[PDB]
Amino acid sequence: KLPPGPTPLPFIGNYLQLNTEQMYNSLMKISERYGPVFTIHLGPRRVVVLCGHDAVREALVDQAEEFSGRGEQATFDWVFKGYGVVFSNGERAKQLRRFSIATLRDFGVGKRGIEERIQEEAGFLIDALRGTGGANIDPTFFLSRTVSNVISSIVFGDRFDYKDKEFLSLLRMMLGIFQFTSTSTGQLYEMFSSVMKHLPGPQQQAFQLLQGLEDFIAKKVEHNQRTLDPNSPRDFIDSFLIRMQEEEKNPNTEFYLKNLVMTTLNLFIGGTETVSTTLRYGFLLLMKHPEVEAKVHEEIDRVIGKNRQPKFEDRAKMPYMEAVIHEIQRFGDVIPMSLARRVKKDTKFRDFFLPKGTEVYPMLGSVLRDPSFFSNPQDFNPQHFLNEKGQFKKSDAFVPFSIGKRNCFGEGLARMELFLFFTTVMQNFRLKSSQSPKDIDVSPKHVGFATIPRNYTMSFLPR
Ligand code: HEM
Ligand SMILES: CC[C@@H]1C(=O)OC[C@@H]1Cc1cncn1C
């Protein structure tokens, strides 16, 4: 009655069928044998796996409510423990998601306000990139300081100074955690956390980075409590603390300190790491494909010029830039197995029985690379989202933010960030790799919870 899958052994589950260094490939290799919907055992953790566009959409959209429960990511749940928007369920999820979405809008997300903040911030990236004097540099922290400063703008009330040593520290913590969760040890941790959380190893270093990010948030919150004005909120934290006051006589309220610290931490991490990684992978992809970079320059110079900052409405007159970013996201596949979902109830799904609480892995990478939706799925080719005529061609398999009821509500900010950061860098600079185009490896360095591109250096040269 459960979907078919390979026979597990007691406790270790399907250990013998999985290579934890390549979870995505192992699962895809299993899906080739069993079909697109299968049951896998991550140790004693039973998970149903959805591969391909049709399986992912049929579950997450066509049966949206049923598949709207949140599952586990054990590394991250070490600190969160079900608190905060991302890892919450039921009433807690309803309440925090509604609040988060509305308070981000109040602070300019999808509005003129945040567009101005992003333009300013891009401005500061531009100056910082000129300041290398065309140097061969690691762009990791330049990109990530810039990106993080936007969400930090919204949640903490001010940006970080690029020279701030504590800022760099947090960014290393973030990079560190995503790194770990995409290593074989990270993925074994997903299978055997109840043992491994008590064992020395890279787990312990990852928990310590998570604890450092937690301590920094709770000290930012403590500061806000001590200085709050209930009639003029400075930031997201302020808004949340005001609601905590209004709610202190509701006995069943989800608005309390632990949910504030953990939601704020979801936002800070969310709004920092994915867009940053996307950009870094982006500049690698473009350096590997000079023909695509040249076509980008052409369009920016024609539609925008050189005399001003790019804006968000510029998107509508720029078919090719939209297709490069969509293709960057589709190739990049930054979060390849989504965040895990779970069935809210005993559930019937295309002739299988899913008991209440069964964890579900929507293989977003299998949709981004579904050969029914994309011609040569393993090639970076911006034409994947283009008319024969050259107009922007959408895709139902374009799913890097997932779909359904618990879909990324950061999509709006991220899309605005990607566009303005990519064009404003492209307008002001051309990209020059440390090796020739043919010797650049664009294959990932780590794939697990995230797709992590290889360490590289590059140069930014003015036009
Ligand atoms: C390149 C950019 C981004 C990518 C690829 C991405 C990807 C994802 C994915 C795959 C999920 C899981 C959704 C699901 O379970 O169906 C998610 C959820 C989430 N994301 Fe993002 N995201 C991005 C940007 C952002 C930004 C900028 C923020 C914060 C401003 C953010 C915050 C969140 C939050 C809070 C959730 C939890 C949704 C929920 O459980 O209700 N993300 N994102
Ligand atoms: C594993 C959950 C991570 C967290 O703490 O909150 C969001 C984050 C994952 C994520 C979702 N959207 C972008 N990111 C980087």
Side-chain angles (χ1 to χ4, degrees), residues 293-392:
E293 186 189 5
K295 281 207 185 73
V296 157
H297 290 132
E298 200 291 310
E299 189 182 60
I300 302 184
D301 285 349
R302 181 164 36 77
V303 179
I304 303 179
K306 284 287 179 59
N307 286 306
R308 67 159 177 87
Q309 295 269 80
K311 57 197 186 193
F312 198 53
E313 51 166 297
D314 286 336
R315 149 183 79 159
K317 300 188 176 195
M318 291 167 84
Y320 193 82
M321 176 62 84
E322 269 289 51
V324 175
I325 309 155
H326 275 64
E327 186 66 4
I328 284 172
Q329 282 193 285
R330 184 205 77 80
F331 196 96
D333 182 26
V334 183
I335 314 296
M337 308 186 302
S338 205
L339 273 57
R341 295 291 193 85
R342 63 169 87 231
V343 295
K344 293 289 291 160
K345 283 194 180 193
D346 282 356
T347 296
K348 250 254 178 291
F349 171 72
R350 56 158 91 177
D351 278 56
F352 310 115
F353 180 73
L354 288 76
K356 199 164 99 89
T358 299
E359 285 191 88
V360 175
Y361 272 28
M363 305 299 278
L364 296 185
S366 72
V367 183
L368 291 162
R369 293 202 213 86
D370 192 324
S372 298
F373 285 76
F374 306 97
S375 84
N376 303 292
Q378 338 273 20
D379 295 340
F380 186 76
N381 183 309
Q383 299 292 137
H384 277 140
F385 296 94
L386 251 6
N387 260 123
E388 57 288 341
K389 323 158 158 288
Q391 323 196 257
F392 182 75

Side-chain angles (χ1 to χ4, degrees), residues 73 76-77 79-80 85-87 178 210 262-263 265-275 334-335 339 401 408 410 449:
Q73 207 295 338
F76 289 103
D77 231 4
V79 78
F80 294 108
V85 71
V86 173
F87 293 99
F178 286 74
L210 278 161
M262 300 303 167
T263 297
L265 182 66
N266 296 135
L267 296 184
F268 183 51
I269 292 181
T272 299
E273 189 63 14
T274 31
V275 162
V334 183
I335 314 296
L339 273 57
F401 303 105
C408 177
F449 173 73

